[PDB]
Design a protein around this motif. Structure first.
Motif, PDB file in Angstrom:
ATOM      1  N   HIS A 239      -5.634  39.041  15.355  1.00  0.00           N
ATOM      2  CA  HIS A 239      -6.839  39.280  16.137  1.00  0.00           C
ATOM      3  C   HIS A 239      -6.520  39.558  17.587  1.00  0.00           C
ATOM      4  O   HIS A 239      -7.197  40.374  18.222  1.00  0.00           O
ATOM      5  N   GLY A 240      -5.480  38.929  18.125  1.00  0.00           N
ATOM      6  CA  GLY A 240      -5.135  39.192  19.507  1.00  0.00           C
ATOM      7  C   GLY A 240      -4.748  40.630  19.784  1.00  0.00           C
ATOM      8  O   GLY A 240      -4.567  40.987  20.954  1.00  0.00           O
ATOM      9  N   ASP A 241      -4.615  41.460  18.747  1.00  0.00           N
ATOM     10  CA  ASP A 241      -4.167  42.836  18.935  1.00  0.00           C
ATOM     11  C   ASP A 241      -2.711  42.893  19.417  1.00  0.00           C
ATOM     12  O   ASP A 241      -2.179  43.981  19.648  1.00  0.00           O
ATOM     13  N   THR A 242      -2.053  41.745  19.605  1.00  0.00           N
ATOM     14  CA  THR A 242      -0.667  41.774  20.063  1.00  0.00           C
ATOM     15  C   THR A 242       0.351  41.385  19.005  1.00  0.00           C
ATOM     16  O   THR A 242       1.487  41.875  19.062  1.00  0.00           O
ATOM     17  N   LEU A 243      -0.002  40.514  18.067  1.00  0.00           N
ATOM     18  CA  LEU A 243       0.888  40.157  16.966  1.00  0.00           C
ATOM     19  C   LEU A 243       0.479  40.919  15.713  1.00  0.00           C
ATOM     20  O   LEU A 243      -0.693  41.246  15.521  1.00  0.00           O
ATOM     21  N   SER A 244       1.454  41.188  14.849  1.00  0.00           N
ATOM     22  CA  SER A 244       1.189  41.750  13.527  1.00  0.00           C
ATOM     23  C   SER A 244       2.156  41.117  12.547  1.00  0.00           C
ATOM     24  O   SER A 244       3.235  40.661  12.931  1.00  0.00           O
ATOM     25  N   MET A 245       1.777  41.123  11.275  1.00  0.00           N
ATOM     26  CA  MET A 245       2.689  40.803  10.187  1.00  0.00           C
ATOM     27  C   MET A 245       3.013  42.094   9.461  1.00  0.00           C
ATOM     28  O   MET A 245       2.100  42.823   9.053  1.00  0.00           O
ATOM     29  N   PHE A 246       4.299  42.375   9.297  1.00  0.00           N
ATOM     30  CA  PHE A 246       4.752  43.517   8.523  1.00  0.00           C
ATOM     31  C   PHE A 246       5.111  42.989   7.155  1.00  0.00           C
ATOM     32  O   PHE A 246       5.695  41.914   7.032  1.00  0.00           O
ATOM     33  N   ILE A 247       4.713  43.715   6.126  1.00  0.00           N
ATOM     34  CA  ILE A 247       5.017  43.354   4.752  1.00  0.00           C
ATOM     35  C   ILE A 247       5.861  44.480   4.184  1.00  0.00           C
ATOM     36  O   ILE A 247       5.463  45.651   4.268  1.00  0.00           O
ATOM     37  N   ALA A 248       7.001  44.140   3.588  1.00  0.00           N
ATOM     38  CA  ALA A 248       7.915  45.137   3.048  1.00  0.00           C
ATOM     39  C   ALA A 248       8.347  44.772   1.642  1.00  0.00           C
ATOM     40  O   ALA A 248       8.766  43.639   1.386  1.00  0.00           O
ATOM     41  N   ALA A 249       8.293  45.739   0.732  1.00  0.00           N
ATOM     42  CA  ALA A 249       8.746  45.471  -0.628  1.00  0.00           C
ATOM     43  C   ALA A 249       9.164  46.776  -1.281  1.00  0.00           C
ATOM     44  O   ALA A 249       8.515  47.809  -1.070  1.00  0.00           O
TER      45      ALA A 249
ATOM     46  N   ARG B   1       5.692  39.929  14.343  1.00  0.00           N
ATOM     47  CA  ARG B   1       6.269  40.607  15.489  1.00  0.00           C
ATOM     48  C   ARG B   1       5.261  40.638  16.632  1.00  0.00           C
ATOM     49  O   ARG B   1       4.074  40.920  16.425  1.00  0.00           O
ATOM     50  N   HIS B   2       5.739  40.348  17.827  1.00  0.00           N
ATOM     51  CA  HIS B   2       4.964  40.518  19.050  1.00  0.00           C
ATOM     52  C   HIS B   2       5.155  41.958  19.518  1.00  0.00           C
ATOM     53  O   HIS B   2       6.238  42.328  19.982  1.00  0.00           O
ATOM     54  N   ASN B   3       4.114  42.775  19.383  1.00  0.00           N
ATOM     55  CA  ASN B   3       4.308  44.219  19.561  1.00  0.00           C
ATOM     56  C   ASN B   3       4.592  44.629  21.000  1.00  0.00           C
ATOM     57  O   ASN B   3       5.385  45.548  21.224  1.00  0.00           O
ATOM     58  N   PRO B   4       3.982  44.003  22.007  1.00  0.00           N
ATOM     59  CA  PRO B   4       4.316  44.396  23.389  1.00  0.00           C
ATOM     60  C   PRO B   4       5.786  44.262  23.735  1.00  0.00           C
ATOM     61  O   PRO B   4       6.291  45.065  24.527  1.00  0.00           O
ATOM     62  N   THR B   5       6.494  43.269  23.182  1.00  0.00           N
ATOM     63  CA  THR B   5       7.893  43.036  23.516  1.00  0.00           C
ATOM     64  C   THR B   5       8.858  43.398  22.405  1.00  0.00           C
ATOM     65  O   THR B   5      10.066  43.496  22.655  1.00  0.00           O
ATOM     66  N   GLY B   6       8.375  43.573  21.192  1.00  0.00           N
ATOM     67  CA  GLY B   6       9.257  43.678  20.057  1.00  0.00           C
ATOM     68  C   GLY B   6       9.733  42.344  19.509  1.00  0.00           C
ATOM     69  O   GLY B   6      10.532  42.331  18.558  1.00  0.00           O
ATOM     70  N   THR B   7       9.284  41.221  20.063  1.00  0.00           N
ATOM     71  CA  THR B   7       9.910  39.958  19.663  1.00  0.00           C
ATOM     72  C   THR B   7       9.627  39.674  18.200  1.00  0.00           C
ATOM     73  O   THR B   7       8.472  39.722  17.752  1.00  0.00           O
ATOM     74  N   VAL B   8      10.682  39.357  17.452  1.00  0.00           N
ATOM     75  CA  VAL B   8      10.532  38.948  16.055  1.00  0.00           C
ATOM     76  C   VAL B   8      10.355  37.429  16.022  1.00  0.00           C
ATOM     77  O   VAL B   8      11.330  36.665  16.087  1.00  0.00           O
ATOM     78  N   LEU B   9       9.107  36.981  15.899  1.00  0.00           N
ATOM     79  CA  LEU B   9       8.802  35.549  15.940  1.00  0.00           C
ATOM     80  C   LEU B   9       9.102  34.858  14.618  1.00  0.00           C
ATOM     81  O   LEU B   9       9.611  33.735  14.611  1.00  0.00           O
ATOM     82  N   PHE B  10       8.736  35.479  13.496  1.00  0.00           N
ATOM     83  CA  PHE B  10       8.949  34.872  12.192  1.00  0.00           C
ATOM     84  C   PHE B  10       9.436  35.920  11.212  1.00  0.00           C
ATOM     85  O   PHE B  10       9.127  37.104  11.333  1.00  0.00           O
ATOM     86  N   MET B  11      10.166  35.461  10.206  1.00  0.00           N
ATOM     87  CA  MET B  11      10.663  36.371   9.194  1.00  0.00           C
ATOM     88  C   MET B  11      10.857  35.570   7.918  1.00  0.00           C
ATOM     89  O   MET B  11      11.100  34.363   7.972  1.00  0.00           O
ATOM     90  N   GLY B  12      10.674  36.208   6.768  1.00  0.00           N
ATOM     91  CA  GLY B  12      10.852  35.415   5.563  1.00  0.00           C
ATOM     92  C   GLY B  12      10.816  36.257   4.309  1.00  0.00           C
ATOM     93  O   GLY B  12      10.522  37.454   4.342  1.00  0.00           O
ATOM     94  N   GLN B  13      11.147  35.609   3.194  1.00  0.00           N
ATOM     95  CA  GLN B  13      11.098  36.235   1.880  1.00  0.00           C
ATOM     96  C   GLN B  13      10.259  35.365   0.961  1.00  0.00           C
ATOM     97  O   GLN B  13      10.532  34.164   0.814  1.00  0.00           O
ATOM     98  N   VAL B  14       9.239  35.968   0.356  1.00  0.00           N
ATOM     99  CA  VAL B  14       8.362  35.278  -0.581  1.00  0.00           C
ATOM    100  C   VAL B  14       8.842  35.674  -1.973  1.00  0.00           C
ATOM    101  O   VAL B  14       8.576  36.782  -2.457  1.00  0.00           O
TER     102      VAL B  14
END
Ligand SMILES: O=C(Nc1cccc(-c2ccoc2)c1)C(=O)Nc1ccc(Cl)cc1C(=O)O
Length: 370
Positions: free
Chosen positions: A228-238, A354-367
């Motif tokens: 909602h902040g428009d600054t963080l996103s979750m990317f999903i890859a499979a 990911r924090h999009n303004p900085t590129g920071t990778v805050l969390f990462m994982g495998q489900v």
């Protein structure tokens, strides 16, 4: 390309390489991890080290905490990441604990505080239960109670002299929440070919989307889900094919690749079906960090912590990260679009916060199994 924040790239690149070591040693089990968190607490640990222990950490992280402007840039990044208000959606804490009666180098403690605006924490490990309680209570009081115990503290005993911990909680509010009414049970296909019926959310939206290929040419989908902040996103890859294992993606991850995913995305109308999940991971960082060349710090009489103390021996007895992440219909708080192309995430997948303004990778994982 990465956004212009150099320290965010440094922290993320190092943290992602640590995650890869964790995922490789956890082939078919769920893992959640914080690249930013591990980089942040090891940047702090740099200040305590010397000799070859310092050289190993600096080589693996790719920078020196003492270099002009590096600590201020990390402090500015922390503020940019954690400053903005959120609905109790994210909490983090770092701590370095050292035996209380160790003679510390004169000027170390003020210098640490000057660079990081936090303190190394003196604890009497001969009072074993009290030391365990102090460490756990620190994590409980600085994650708003969402993480209240580290199982690794069960290894703290009267011989412990130096401990490091990093703990993070995340449960973000989507920019467009999934409608509660569309959640439903659906088969999830596990890496061994067995299936399990699990709750999956669904929503139709215009999603940022791209298709990449691995070096072996397997196609994989990447979707962006903004918070909602428009600054963080979750990317999903499979991977597109069920027969391609998730390791095909985790083996090629990098901070640079994630920026390339985002640069190549366009917004497409799609029905997204995604499993809900609630994952918690506590990792002993020793083996992953050893694999990246940081072996001295864990070995008595070989570790060099002489910027912190001249007493011998002194080495890291315990280095822990604990992360808890929730993915649900709207994060921490309480309408369907009624046929487009569908993307059904019903097999093991990677996620990246990911924090999009900085590129920071805050969390990462495998489900591997929600
Ligand atoms: O602060 C400390 N020790 C210290 C010693 C000498 C100098 C300085 C100093 C700081 C800035 O300039 C000089 C600090 C300390 O042990 N803290 C703590 C210990 C246990 C726990 Cl659970 C929390 C804390 C905290 O701090 O929250």
């Amino acid at each position: 390309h990465h956004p212009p924040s150099y320290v965010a790239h440094l922290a993320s690149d190092f943290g992602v390489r640590v995650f890869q070591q964790v995922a490789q040693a956890s082939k078919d089990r769920n893992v959640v991890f914080s690249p930013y968190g591990v980089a942040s607490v090891l940047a702090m640990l740099q200040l305590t080290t010397g000799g070859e222990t310092q050289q190993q950490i600096q080589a693996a992280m790719g920078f020196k905490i003492d270099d002009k402007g590096m600590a201020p840039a990390l402090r500015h990044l922390y503020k940019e990441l954690m400053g903005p208000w959120n609905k109790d959606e994210i909490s983090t804490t770092d701590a370095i604990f050292v035996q209380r009666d160790l003679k510390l180098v004169q000027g170390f403690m003020p210098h640490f505080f000057r660079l990081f605006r936090s303190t190394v924490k003196q604890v009497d490990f001969s009072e074993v239960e009290r030391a365990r309680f102090i460490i756990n209570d620190w994590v409980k009081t600085h994650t708003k109670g969402m993480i209240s115990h580290l199982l690794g503290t069960g290894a703290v005993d009267q011989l412990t002299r130096l401990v490091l911990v990093n703990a993070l909680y995340f449960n973000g509010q989507w920019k467009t929440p999934f409608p509660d009414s569309s959640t439903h049970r659906r088969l999830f296909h596990k890496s061994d070919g067995s299936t399990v019926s699990v709750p999956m959310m669904a929503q139709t939206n215009k999603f940022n989307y791209t298709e990449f290929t691995t070096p072996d040419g397997h196609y994989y989908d990447i979707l962006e889900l903004p918070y909602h902040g428009d600054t963080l996103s979750m990317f999903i890859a499979a991977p597109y094919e069920k027969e391609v294992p998730l390791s095909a993606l985790t083996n090629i991850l990098s901070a640079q690749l994630i920026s390339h995913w985002k640069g190549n995305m366009t917004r497409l109308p799609r029905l997204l079906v995604l499993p809900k999940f609630s994952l918690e991971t506590e990792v002993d960082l020793r083996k992953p960090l050893e694999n990246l060349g940081m072996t001295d710090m864990f070995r008595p009489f070989q570790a060099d912590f002489t910027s912190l103390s001249d007493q011998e021996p002194l080495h890291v007895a315990l280095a822990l990260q604990k992360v808890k992440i929730e993915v649900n219909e709207s994060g921490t708080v309480a309408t369907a679009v009624i046929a487009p192309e569908e993307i059904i995430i019903d097999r093991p997948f990677l996620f990246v916060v990911r924090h999009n303004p900085t590129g920071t990778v805050l969390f990462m994982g495998q489900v591997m199994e929600p």
